[PDB]
Symmetry: C5
Subunit: 46 residues, 5 copies
């Protein structure tokens, strides 16, 4: 019945949030790759 | 007549959980960004 | 009527999954915050 | 009304994908904790 | 009924984003696995 319009707003907010997890992950991937790079060039390690 | 309310509830339950997942990531990012800086300043490497 | 009970089962499983993912992240953040503190006190970096 | 069969598909796919993300997080923490244990007994930091 | 279709757009969208999150993670894990193997191969630790 009248519950359908909100089901939409919930599926609307489940995408707004996921969109944010989508970019914060792609950021963390870059930061990690970078973290990896600094270690590859670590004289202390050899 | 239908299971619409039980459905509406699960949806909003997916959101509240996504709320926590979104926050844990934001925090985890400040941590990996901090970590990354320490090894760039680490005397032992370069 | 046919798939409605099935659209509820899946939703409930979406949260069960997201429930473990939610508690899985909590542990990852802490391990990562421990690794940071550890690296910080590292007597070779500073 | 018709649209339930197609909506069910998208949900089963949602749980198949999430099904993978769950295990990925279980392995990511697995090695994060090994990375921890590694820097702790690391004779450079002590 | 009236909005049934609009709910299908959102679901399909969460699927797409899930694939993105998914493939981002299999990469982040691929990287963290390297960082682990590398710190283990660090001569500074011994
Ligand atoms: C994609 C998505 C799901 C959420 C997945 C998340 C929130 C994955 C988070 C993974 C984390 C970020 C990994 C951190 O290393 C939900 C269940 C809402 C259903 C449909 C959309």
């Amino acid at each position: 019945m009248d519950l359908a319009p909100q089901m939409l707003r919930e599926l609307q907010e489940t995408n707004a949030a996921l969109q944010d997890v989508r970019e914060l992950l792609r950021q963390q991937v870059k930061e990690i790759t970078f973290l990896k790079n600094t270690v590859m060039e670590c004289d202390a390690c050899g």
